[PDB]
Write an enzyme that holds these catalytic residues in place. Structure first.
Site, PDB file in Angstrom:
ATOM      1  N   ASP A 181       0.761  -1.135  -0.087  1.00 50.43           N
ATOM      2  CA  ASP A 181       0.111  -0.027  -0.102  1.00 50.43           C
ATOM      3  C   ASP A 181       0.814   1.370   0.028  1.00 50.43           C
ATOM      4  O   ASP A 181       1.976   1.326   0.683  1.00 50.43           O
ATOM      5  CB  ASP A 181      -0.748  -0.126   1.133  1.00 50.43           C
ATOM      6  CG  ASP A 181      -1.879   1.212   1.457  1.00 50.43           C
ATOM      7  OD1 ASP A 181      -2.702   1.116   0.380  1.00 50.43           O
ATOM      8  OD2 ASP A 181      -1.709   1.984   2.163  1.00 50.43           O
ATOM      9  N   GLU A 222       1.648  -0.460  -4.910  1.00 50.63           N
ATOM     10  CA  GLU A 222       0.807   0.431  -5.282  1.00 50.63           C
ATOM     11  C   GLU A 222       1.628   1.963  -5.532  1.00 50.63           C
ATOM     12  O   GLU A 222       1.731   2.724  -4.843  1.00 50.63           O
ATOM     13  CB  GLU A 222      -0.504   0.779  -4.421  1.00 50.63           C
ATOM     14  CG  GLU A 222      -1.397   1.608  -4.958  1.00 50.63           C
ATOM     15  CD  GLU A 222      -2.006   2.615  -4.221  1.00 50.63           C
ATOM     16  OE1 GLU A 222      -3.104   3.278  -4.258  1.00 50.63           O
ATOM     17  OE2 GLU A 222      -1.579   2.730  -2.517  1.00 50.63           O
TER      18      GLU A 222
END
Ligand SMILES: OC[C@H]1O[C@@H]2O[C@H]3[C@H](O)[C@@H](O)[C@@H](O[C@H]4[C@H](O)[C@@H](O)[C@@H](O[C@H]5[C@H](O)[C@@H](O)[C@@H](O[C@H]6[C@H](O)[C@@H](O)[C@@H](O[C@H]7[C@H](O)[C@@H](O)[C@@H](O[C@H]1[C@H](O)[C@H]2O)O[C@@H]7CO)O[C@@H]6CO)O[C@@H]5CO)O[C@@H]4CO)O[C@@H]3CO
Ligand SMILES: OC[C@H]1O[C@@H]2O[C@H]3[C@H](O)[C@@H](O)[C@@H](O[C@H]4[C@H](O)[C@@H](O)[C@@H](O[C@H]5[C@H](O)[C@@H](O)[C@@H](O[C@H]6[C@H](O)[C@@H](O)[C@@H](O[C@H]7[C@H](O)[C@@H](O)[C@@H](O[C@H]1[C@H](O)[C@H]2O)O[C@@H]7CO)O[C@@H]6CO)O[C@@H]5CO)O[C@@H]4CO)O[C@@H]3CO
Ligand SMILES: OC[C@H]1O[C@@H]2O[C@H]3[C@H](O)[C@@H](O)[C@@H](O[C@H]4[C@H](O)[C@@H](O)[C@@H](O[C@H]5[C@H](O)[C@@H](O)[C@@H](O[C@H]6[C@H](O)[C@@H](O)[C@@H](O[C@H]7[C@H](O)[C@@H](O)[C@@H](O[C@H]1[C@H](O)[C@H]2O)O[C@@H]7CO)O[C@@H]6CO)O[C@@H]5CO)O[C@@H]4CO)O[C@@H]3CO
Ligand SMILES: [Ca+2]
Ligand SMILES: [Cl-]
Length: 496
Positions: free
Chosen positions: A197, A233
């Site tokens: 993330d 990401e």
């Protein structure tokens, strides 16, 4: 780091967004295993802060308070059970690793957390880890607000607070090690890899130092010496100070240009048309295929103001969504992730959904079970895109054609296009406002094939459209612009 570690012959993963662990375990056994899905991306399994303003939004799960495996999705026993059961039918589990930050700096001190751990965000105290004030970047960020004021400055993006979230001092070995210990617990349990993330908000070097500490995968299911699959990401639509190529040394990277551009093309905005997709992939300025994780939508941008903005296609736009997902799953570029959603009450105020915070279907905060209907759809406002015939059969299509080259491209100069994959699959689209009726070279051996978009092969018959291919590889395709699904796909395993 780049290899997905799926069972041989399985080529996609699915995001079962906010699903409970017990429901994922069941889905692996009754559906994902039998239907050829490679794996599941799960919501963050570690303890997060409880947000009551508004009431239990999806995004509270991106605000960690410890690395205890205790969330609304379930507890540590239920997580382990899910991983074991999914692996045992050949479906891998990929964890959403939230490692850039802890919870909001403005959150109240106390035990309003998913497992009852104490924290004090204002004093940067997280005793359940433990972390203290010197494990955060407050001293390192140079902005007056403590937040990111310019995305043009790579230092601010990485060292300052992303929407007020406490930013971890990832340069420090103590912090790298606490995070590695968490990821290594999950690996030893049987997890195959991780989504990292908010990777844009960390230095590639700090990420690498965490990854270098990770265990090989569990030999009960994986060959010896296997490394976890890593996808990072990073949102980079081009012309930004931080580039997704900065992260290629660590693993794959989310290619957000993919859904943004495909959305725009399939909607026919900005003068775009499907015939432009002849050189889709690297030809469009995308990262190399062997570094890309691709998707039409994700959990953030399906809410309409993330990367791609309004161009992004979602389940709300079902007909065009299936077209885009179909194109993605047939095309050889990238490693594909399919989205799986829940429904919420959208409320647009000035082209902005003010209900974009709403969390998963729930009874007073408790996530509802995924119910399965007789027709194989889901109840309780779970959308279950991965169960739609058109999507599940294109997941199988990608398995069947794996390794076969892009071939036999055709277009009408506008929005009707077709292509195949070697001699094992062929797909045809009509996104124009008029009829498609043409005899095209398919590259396939002569025979009668079931169209896997309108139906299935069941026994020695087809439940939808049948396509007869001549001995020379040609076939007629007829698709009206008012067809429910304006595309047809056939492959080696749908031949009678
Ligand atoms: O006042 C009523 C409120 O009281 C208690 O809230 C506490 C909360 O528990 C504390 O942690 C803290 O809140 C902080 C946040 O931690 C911090 O992130 C920020 O919050 C901003 C939000 O993040 C942002 O979403 C927005 O909040 C909107 C919210 O989305 C709306 O839904 C609406 O919130 C209402 C709640 O829905 C309602 O239950 C009740 O909330 C209680 C809460 O249950 C209780 O724990 O009323 C609120 C207000 O109508 O409106 C808000 C505000 O626009 O914006 C906020 C603010 O920027 O900052 C807050 C404030 O420190 O402190 C509060 C006590 O104030
Ligand atoms: O569990 C959290 C944390 O809570 C407490 O820390 C308090 C402490 O009680 C206070 O005295 C004060 O810190 C003092 C230190 O006591 C004192 O040593 C010195 O700090 C220096 C240290 O000697 C030096 O080692 C370094 O600390 C490192 C540390 O070696 C790393 O391991 C890491 O710290 C982590 C610990 O490993 C971990 O057990 C826990 O620490 C407890 C602590 O036991 C408890 O007393 O968490 C921390 C990180 O969360 O990183 C640090 C930072 O480099 O730091 C200096 C060397 O210059 O002086 C300080 C005065 O501030 O306040 C802390 C709260 O921050
Ligand atoms: O309580 C924390 C926070 O949690 C939730 O954030 C979600 C969000 O719902 C998702 O959309 C996504 O956020 C993305 C953004 O989409 C992306 O653009 C970028 O963020 C940048 C913003 O685009 C940019 O506008 C600016 O943000 C400002 C912001 O305008 C200020 O209002 C202020 O943020 C406050 C929020 O207003 C307040 O609601 C709350 O934040 C919530 C958020 O509402 C909720 O949706 O508190 C903060 C307090 O500061 O300041 C910032 C400037 O720092 O710049 C940011 C980059 O900082 O990236 C994010 C991250 O993905 O995902 C998050 C979940 O992480
Ligand atoms: Ca950071
Ligand atoms: Cl993502």
């Amino acid at each position: 780091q780049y290899a997905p570690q799926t069972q041989s012959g399985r080529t996609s993963i699915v995001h079962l967004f906010e699903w409970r662990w017990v429901d994922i375990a069941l889905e692996c056994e009754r559906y994902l295993g039998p239907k050829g899905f490679g794996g599941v991306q799960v919501s963050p399994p570690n303890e997060n802060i409880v947000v009551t303003n508004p009431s239990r939004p999806w995004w509270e799960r991106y605000q960690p308070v410890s690395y205890k495996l205790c969330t609304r999705s379930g507890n540590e026993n239920e997580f382990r059970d899910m991983v074991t059961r999914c692996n045992n039918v050949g479906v891998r589990i990929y964890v959403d690793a939230v490692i850039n930050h802890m919870c909001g700096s403005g959150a109240a001190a106390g035990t309003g957390t998913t497992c009852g751990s104490y924290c004090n965000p204002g004093n940067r105290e997280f005793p359940a880890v433990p972390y203290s004030a010197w494990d955060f970047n407050d001293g390192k960020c140079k902005t007056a607000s403590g937040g990111i004021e310019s995305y043009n400055d790579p230092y601010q993006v990485r060292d300052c607070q992303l929407v007020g979230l406490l930013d971890l001092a990832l340069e420090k070995d103590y912090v790298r090690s606490m995070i590695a210990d968490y990821l290594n617990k999950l690996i030893d349990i049987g997890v195959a890899g991780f989504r990292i993330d908010a990777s844009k908000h960390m230095w590639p070097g700090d990420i690498k130092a965490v990854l270098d500490k990770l265990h090989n995968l569990n030999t009960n299911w994986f060959p010896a010496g296997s490394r976890p699959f890593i996808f990072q990401e990073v949102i980079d639509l081009g012309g930004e100070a931080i580039q997704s190529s900065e992260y290629f040394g660590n693993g794959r990277v989310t290619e957000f240009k993919y859904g943004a551009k495909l959305g725009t093309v399939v909607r026919k905005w900005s003068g775009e048309k499907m015939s432009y997709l002849k050189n889709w992939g690297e030809g469009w300025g995308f990262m190399p295929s062997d570094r890309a994780l691709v998707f039409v939508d994700n959990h953030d941008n399906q809410r309409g103001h993330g990367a791609g903005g309004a161009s992004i296609l979602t389940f709300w736009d079902a007909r065009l969504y299936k077209v885009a997902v179909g194109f993605m799953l047939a095309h050889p570029y990238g490693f594909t992730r399919v989205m799986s959603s829940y429904r919420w009450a959208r409320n647009f105020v000035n082209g902005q959904d003010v209900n974009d915070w709403i969390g998963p279907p729930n009874n007073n905060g408790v996530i509802k079970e995924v119910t399965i209907n007789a027709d194989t759809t889901c109840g309780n406002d779970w959308v279950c895109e991965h169960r739609w015939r058109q999507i599940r059969n294109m997941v199988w299509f990608r398995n069947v054609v794996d390794g076969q080259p892009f071939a036999n491209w055709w277009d009408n100069g506008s929005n009707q296009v077709a292509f195949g994959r070697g001699n094992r699959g062929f797909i045809v689209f009509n996104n124009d406002d008029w009829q498609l009726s043409s005899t095209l070279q398919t590259g396939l051996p002569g025979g009668t094939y079931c169209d896997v978009i309108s139906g299935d092969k069941v026994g020695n018959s087809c439940t939808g459209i049948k396509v007869y291919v001549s001995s020379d590889g040609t076939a007629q395709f007829s698709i009206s612009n008012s067809a429910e699904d304006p595309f047809i796909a056939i492959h080696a395993e749908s031949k009678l």
